[PDB]
Design a protein around this ligand. Structure first.
Ligand SMILES: [Ca+2]
Ligand SMILES: [Ca+2]
Length: 75
């Protein structure tokens, strides 16, 4: 799924809960569940995965750091 998809995915889901802009750890959950269940051919759990994803801040991800996901979908 191209950059132009994933850009539209991230934004919509980042706005699931109170905040419009970041992906919370518990917000990534729903995202993954709906859109990536078969794509997660790994061992990594949510929290472990989030903790690759979020550079060093610790509360919520945003598209910036989500580009690690955009890489790892080829991984
Ligand atoms: Ca949010
Ligand atoms: Ca962050």
């Amino acid at each position: 799924k191209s950059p132009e998809e994933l850009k539209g995915i991230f934004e919509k889901y980042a706005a699931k809960e109170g905040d419009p802009n970041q992906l919370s750890k518990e917000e990534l959950k729903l995202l993954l569940q709906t859109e990536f269940p078969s794509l997660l051919k790994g061992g990594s759990t949510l929290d472990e995965l989030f903790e690759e994803l979020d550079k060093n801040g610790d509360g919520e991800v945003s598209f910036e750091e989500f580009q690690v996901l955009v890489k790892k979908i080829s991984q």
